[PDB]
Amino acid sequence: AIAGFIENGWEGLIDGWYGFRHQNAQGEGTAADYKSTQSAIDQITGKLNRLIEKTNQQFELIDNEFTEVEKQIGNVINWTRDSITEVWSYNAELLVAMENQHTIDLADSEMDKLYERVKRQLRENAEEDGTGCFEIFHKCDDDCMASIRNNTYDHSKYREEAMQNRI
Amino acid sequence: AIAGFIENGWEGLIDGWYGFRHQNAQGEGTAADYKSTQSAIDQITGKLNRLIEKTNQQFELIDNEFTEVEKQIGNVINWTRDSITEVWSYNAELLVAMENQHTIDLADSEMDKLYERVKRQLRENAEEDGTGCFEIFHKCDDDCMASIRNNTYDHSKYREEAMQNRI
Amino acid sequence: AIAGFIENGWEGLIDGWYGFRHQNAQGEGTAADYKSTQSAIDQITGKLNRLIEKTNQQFELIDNEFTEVEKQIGNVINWTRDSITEVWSYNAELLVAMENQHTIDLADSEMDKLYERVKRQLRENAEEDGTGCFEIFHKCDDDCMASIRNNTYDHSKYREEAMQNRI
Amino acid sequence: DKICLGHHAVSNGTKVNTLTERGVEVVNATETVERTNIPRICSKGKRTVDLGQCGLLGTITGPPQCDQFLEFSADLIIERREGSDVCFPGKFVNEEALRQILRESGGIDKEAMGFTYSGIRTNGATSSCRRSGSSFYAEMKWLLSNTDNAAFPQMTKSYKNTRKNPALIVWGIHHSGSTAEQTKLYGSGNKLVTVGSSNYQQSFVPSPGARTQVNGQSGRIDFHWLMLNPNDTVTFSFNGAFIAPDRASFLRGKSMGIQSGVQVDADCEGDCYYSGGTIISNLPFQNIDSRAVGKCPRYVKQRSLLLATGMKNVPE
Amino acid sequence: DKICLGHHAVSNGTKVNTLTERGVEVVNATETVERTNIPRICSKGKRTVDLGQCGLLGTITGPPQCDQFLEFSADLIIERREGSDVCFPGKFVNEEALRQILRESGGIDKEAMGFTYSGIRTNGATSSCRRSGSSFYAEMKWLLSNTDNAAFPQMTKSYKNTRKNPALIVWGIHHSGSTAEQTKLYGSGNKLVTVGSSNYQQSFVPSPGARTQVNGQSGRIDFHWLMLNPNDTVTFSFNGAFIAPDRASFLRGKSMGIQSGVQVDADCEGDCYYSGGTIISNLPFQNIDSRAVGKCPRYVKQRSLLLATGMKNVPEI
Amino acid sequence: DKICLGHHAVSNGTKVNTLTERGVEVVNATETVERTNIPRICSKGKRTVDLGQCGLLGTITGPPQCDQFLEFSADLIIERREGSDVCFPGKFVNEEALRQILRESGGIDKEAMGFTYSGIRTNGATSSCRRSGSSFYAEMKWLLSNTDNAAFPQMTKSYKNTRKNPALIVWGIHHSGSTAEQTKLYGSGNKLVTVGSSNYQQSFVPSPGARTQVNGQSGRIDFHWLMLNPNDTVTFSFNGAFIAPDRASFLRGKSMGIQSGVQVDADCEGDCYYSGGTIISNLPFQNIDSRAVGKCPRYVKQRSLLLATGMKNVPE
Ligand SMILES: *[C@@H]1O[C@H](CO)[C@@H](O)[C@H](O[C@@H]2O[C@H](CO)[C@@H](O)[C@H](O)[C@H]2NC(C)=O)[C@H]1NC(C)=O
Ligand SMILES: *[C@@H]1O[C@H](CO)[C@@H](O[C@@H]2O[C@H](CO)[C@@H](O)[C@H](O)[C@H]2NC(C)=O)[C@H](O)[C@H]1NC(C)=O
Ligand SMILES: *[C@@H]1O[C@H](CO)[C@@H](O[C@@H]2O[C@H](CO)[C@@H](O)[C@H](O)[C@H]2NC(C)=O)[C@H](O)[C@H]1NC(C)=O
Ligand SMILES: *[C@@H]1O[C@H](CO)[C@@H](O)[C@H](O)[C@H]1NC(C)=O
Ligand SMILES: *[C@@H]1O[C@H](CO)[C@@H](O)[C@H](O)[C@H]1NC(C)=O
Ligand SMILES: *[C@@H]1O[C@H](CO)[C@@H](O)[C@H](O)[C@H]1NC(C)=O
Ligand SMILES: *[C@@H]1O[C@H](CO)[C@@H](O)[C@H](O)[C@H]1NC(C)=O
Ligand SMILES: *[C@@H]1O[C@H](CO)[C@@H](O)[C@H](O)[C@H]1NC(C)=O
Ligand SMILES: *[C@@H]1O[C@H](CO)[C@@H](O)[C@H](O)[C@H]1NC(C)=O
Ligand SMILES: *[C@@H]1O[C@H](CO)[C@@H](O)[C@H](O)[C@H]1NC(C)=O
Ligand SMILES: *[C@@H]1O[C@H](CO)[C@@H](O)[C@H](O)[C@H]1NC(C)=O
Ligand SMILES: *[C@@H]1O[C@H](CO)[C@@H](O)[C@H](O)[C@H]1NC(C)=O
């Protein structure tokens, strides 16, 4: 019924970027994580703040549109300008390609940080199903779904039941 | 005898880049992972398609081999060309170094993605021994090898097998 | 009392970069992992040796400070130099930012490699607690933990005691 | 019970170029290459001189069409395609260096040189330049050689620059268009003009040949210029065809000059300009004008580059 | 049972440079910097002119070496070291700018000036240029007076550019080898050549005098050029010492030029050329010639750079 | 019981930048941009000629400030702000190109021409510069008339350049202070100078100046430069006002000339030189001088960029 980031995304998660889905006794539900989305957003915002900034070097005109400059100096200026344009076109294409690769890998990394943190938090009380979800073998209510959502979950008081359900 | 990527590469894989080795009571040997190889090859070929992209900028001569240009403009052209050459040598070495680091890290990451896929598929039925091998406690000589290579493996039937035997 | 890299670093680990901290009935102490720090520092030194490479292109004077060159050629030279300065300032910021991100990510990936190596070597005899430590369920002395640092800990021990302690 | 971790998605996202794959769909992305512009010049908070019917160099020699801009003060100088630097036909040597100096000049602060002449007609009226009747450049004196055919004496004049800033000194050489007209206007004989200073030296000779008639006249004025260091002196020596300066041009400070074909909109703020308008954007790159002047994004060939502002799109 | 993952490896492999460490062994890697070439210029699908003995600038003035190339039309212009654009010693002023104009010009379409002369013989000739017997440059008339020591009259000529394209107008000034030669050639007097147009004005003064002998004679021609806007008129004024154009040179379109020492190959399609041949290879970089022109890979200094096409070659045990 | 993994951290870390966040604290970091120079020009293992009041261009003509450097060898050429390339006032045409080739020249060699023609005063001198009494550049003769108010004879002279290397030929044209000075130095006439070669062919005409007074005199020498291909012949032809060379000059090797205002040291070695000193550093970048000469770090605008050499500094 529900699947995680391994096979598909979750259309409908309007508030935030990262979150949890639940299949509880009360049925299906969705909630935002809020911390991981804000971390990813802060990092992307930082990247944009570094790249989306204007320079401080003012450039003057060295040619003239109305009256053409001398052919030898005009051709040297045009060659230098075209080589600079090639350098900045290369730098812009490379910058956008690595920043898109870093943004995508960053977001998948943040999804993974949330996933490993939840795995470490659940310890032996949950087992991976291979689709980005954790199958929990101790019957746990909404108060305990919320305990999983934030960093308040305590391994104690579920270990014996989850192990007996797994063994 | 059954080497792993963590310690050593394989010289027996001629049908691809990534694959599996098997040891059981019916036989021993290797098989290639078609999907992982094709994915890694498609990403590297796309990388090359970006790098090998032809430039559309037409450059003209601004110097002269047969006669010499004026020494001041000549030295300005030589300096500009050498500075541009230093820029392109820097970009070429940075690009090759970053593409080689990204290519090696990408292929090893893809090996990790497949490795995690196998671990996730097996769940409680196998243990990582740190050499790149999975020690499997569910005895299978034939169908399980193809099933594990594919995604069409139903770990639950043998699950009982991978707890009794490892406890 | 003791927390690892997930929550905090160490201030008393003067010798080395990567290391272990130990609590037992015989006392407490800290010891560095020579191989991990030596590998990480060798990689960082190689990175520095690449960055500190000196160019073999000797640049000459084009402008003249005591007697100003002609305004048109002087302004073309100043525009070209300012554009090259912008290119090298961009490349310098991009290189320093990328290498700082790769140094931080390298240190954390290597720390994770050491973490996984310990988990792989211990198998079911230890469980991560989520704060950068592995809880050892059976009791042991300093020598077997030194063997863990020494990469000579044999898991083929009386597993049943650790299993009974977990269950 | 089961919990699933994951991320949001949209039914229709946007595509970005990554290192290995050309078309990765992402939830969100923004442009890094600016393509939008405003057809008007954004010049708010800056002193702007709209040099209609007048070029940058016309503020030095003073053709009638530039009379209001002789002592202009500006932070932004806008040169127009329909304008001209020269009214009586002619041109400058090293036009580009002088225009580059004027664009950065901060405006022009002129001071009279104090040259007094006697026995010389200083009217120099020409039908090609008019305010009323026939009137030559306001700021240049065309030293005719008295009554027709009279000899022109070999005069020596000098100007000392006493200010902290260097002086811009401009003069011309008159090419009469024929030897009959040069003999009539400046008298008979060969003419020579020399200019000296500490760090500049030159000589000029008139060329009274024959030229294509432009704006009613076939002669041409070749304009020359000198940058005079503080506390130095420029000395001129001439047998005629000197077209003497009346005032020296000093630099007011710093400014930036632009070329533009569109009207000025003084309620818009920006600091980088191009021929067809202004580019107000904080994006790192542009695809508008490869020769734009000012603090504009860096020019790239690519029409559009999308830098992802969100993760990858996985449609389900 | 057991399963294990692994990866392909080879006994040898190659080495690459990575971001953190140099000399990483990989299974395979390719070069991004080209070093192999064809020692010949490959030009197919383009009109190519091979200016063997004649320099590109002579395609305006018409030395005998390029009588067949006076009105040449080409997409690719080959200039060779052994050629010269001078048959009577001399040179163009700002010759590099004019060479740059001609390389991009697409060829030369010449339209007659329509000039008529009277009282001046136009059959000037030199022993340096030897088209047959003694002949002068084809596209220019060497004006004399009449007989030896005869005065040269002052005259004015003009040409209107009636086409939509700008005209390239080229003329020369003759600097005699001595004042005695000028006494024989152009008589005696002060010489002044004046050239003007709506956006151009210049004048030239001949300077007779002894010079080192080149190709057997000391006299020299300095060649000058003008770019004439449509509907504009160039006015010329002479007192002598003028090498007059007979036809204006119009540009045909767009082309590129090559300075090279190798033969032309009509079979390969190529974009990047250098003095030793052509570089036909879709690699990011080249380390062959820093002045290569056309749609060419970027020049780098490294002898080679190996970019991995696979992962690190962890050897088998 | 518990095995812990962790890493070394420091309580007072260093801030570095990353692609994603600024001000990230790391355990250790170094600089990649050098800001510290050594105030002295430290030159060892390279032959250095420490010019004083003589610039590099003047080493062709031989002014009294550097008579000891009329011929020299060097790997390093140092020009000074307080120096001069002239003693008698003058200026070179295309002086920057000539200085540029001299900085690379490796030193200077010599040959000689002659100018032994009768009727000519070959040892002219001025009051501007002296060795004891009035003197002149060792490398030039002036060619004044043998007696006052005597017509200068027209003459030709040529140099065959019988050497493998191209010859550096420098000669002057004298622009008299006034026409009366020209009559005093040379007899009446229309002065003309031509220089022929297979690729130079340049004409010059003296233009009496009536210029300002520099170093006590109003006249001036205009120095002209020709670089002569091997085995080519330079032919000079003149009617006077020709500051003839005594010696023909040649290049010696390879050098890297610099301009500076500071003293020369010699107890260390380095390759990067600039107006204020040298840069001895292996860092990839520097922020001292955009005009730095030699095999040195690349100029950037940033004062400092810190490259992390350690782990992220997470405390406790
Ligand atoms: C620097 O500029 C000079 C002219 O100002 C130019 O001669 C140099 O290159 C020349 O290139 C020729 C063709 O490759 C070569 O034969 C010649 O030896 C070489 N000049 C020198 C001194 O080696 C320009 N430098 C470069 C690197 O092109
Ligand atoms: C240098 O490049 C500019 C364009 O970036 C050239 O200017 C153009 O020239 C064409 C010639 O037909 C005109 O149609 C365009 O309108 C011009 N554009 C501008 C903005 O001026 C310039 O001619 C080139 N320089 C040389 C020497 O060719
Ligand atoms: C090119 O830029 C340099 C600055 O790097 C200019 O040199 C400075 O010019 C100012 C003008 O007042 C002087 O005060 C400085 O002392 C100069 N510094 C140096 C190191 O020369 C130079 O004038 C510019 N050139 C042109 C043609 O504009
Ligand atoms: C975690 O969520 C539960 C939900 O009710 C809340 O009561 C608790 O205070 C939260 N704890 C923290 C630390 O946010
Ligand atoms: C598993 O994949 C192999 C091809 O590698 C195929 O022949 C086999 O039929 C697949 N097994 C199943 C159950 O689909
Ligand atoms: C570590 O391993 C080496 C392997 O030879 C062994 O000699 C050494 O004694 C070991 N040390 C410890 C503390 O186990
Ligand atoms: C993309 O992000 C920008 C700013 O974060 C926002 O204004 C815009 O609406 C977003 N678009 C979509 C489709 O999410
Ligand atoms: C010019 O020289 C005088 C000499 O006393 C000095 O007082 C004055 O300040 C100088 N002016 C400039 C602009 O250098
Ligand atoms: C490895 O790369 C080389 C590059 O030339 C290629 O020829 C070879 O076929 C490649 N090998 C494989 C197995 O892809
Ligand atoms: C001026 O030139 C244009 C082409 O640029 C041409 O159409 C027009 O007819 C010309 N003017 C005259 C009067 O022929
Ligand atoms: C390092 O410590 C000193 C004082 O101990 C302090 O002034 C300095 O700011 C610290 N460094 C940083 C980066 O805060
Ligand atoms: C940082 O590394 C350098 C390497 O030379 C060392 O000298 C310095 O002491 C180190 N500083 C710290 C705080 O580790």
Side-chain angles (χ1 to χ4, degrees), chain E residues 219-240:
Chain E
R220 310 294 184 87
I221 278 154
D222 286 317
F223 291 98
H224 299 271
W225 59 279
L226 182 152
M227 225 55 192
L228 176 60
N229 284 311
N231 308 349
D232 186 329
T233 301
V234 180
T235 299
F236 297 88
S237 308
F238 322 130
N239 294 8

Side-chain angles (χ1 to χ4, degrees), chain C residues 63-65 68-71 74-75 78, chain D residues 104, chain F residues 290-291:
Chain C
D63 318 58
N64 187 333
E65 180 173 359
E68 187 175 297
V69 299
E70 300 91 290
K71 257 299 189 325
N75 284 326
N78 270 0
Chain D
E104 72 178 353
Chain F
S290 68
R291 313 179 70 279

Side-chain angles (χ1 to χ4, degrees), chain D residues 190, chain E residues 154 182 188-192 205-206 239-240, chain F residues 190:
Chain D
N190 294 318
Chain E
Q154 185 179 96
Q182 190 173 63
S188 180
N190 294 323
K191 304 299 189 185
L192 180 69
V205 178
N239 294 8
Chain F
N190 185 11

Side-chain angles (χ1 to χ4, degrees), chain B residues 63 65 68-71 74-75 78 81-82, chain E residues 290-291:
Chain B
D63 289 345
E65 211 166 59
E68 254 186 357
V69 299
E70 298 324 78
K71 288 284 186 288
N75 285 330
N78 283 21
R81 188 182 300 111
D82 279 6
Chain E
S290 67
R291 308 190 306 87

Side-chain angles (χ1 to χ4, degrees), chain E residues 90-91 207-208 210 212 220 222, chain F residues 156 197 199-201 203 233 235:
Chain E
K91 63 187 179 72
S207 321
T212 183
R220 310 294 184 87
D222 286 317
Chain F
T156 325
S197 75
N199 37 12
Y200 191 67
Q201 208 161 262
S203 174
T233 300
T235 300

Side-chain angles (χ1 to χ4, degrees), chain D residues 162-164 230-231:
Chain D
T162 62
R163 290 176 58 156
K164 290 179 181 178
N231 259 344

Side-chain angles (χ1 to χ4, degrees), chain A residues 21 24 63-65 100 133, chain D residues 1 4 7 259 275 291 308 315:
Chain A
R21 275 84 72 178
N24 214 347
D63 60 15
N64 190 65
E65 173 184 340
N100 287 339
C133 307
Chain D
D1 288 6
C4 293
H7 53 78
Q259 296 186 303
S275 286
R291 61 183 290 275

Side-chain angles (χ1 to χ4, degrees), chain F residues 18-19 30 91 123 127 153 179 213 239 314:
Chain F
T18 62
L19 301 107
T30 190
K91 186 170 173 278
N123 54 27
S127 66
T179 278
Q213 295 212 299
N239 201 153
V314 316

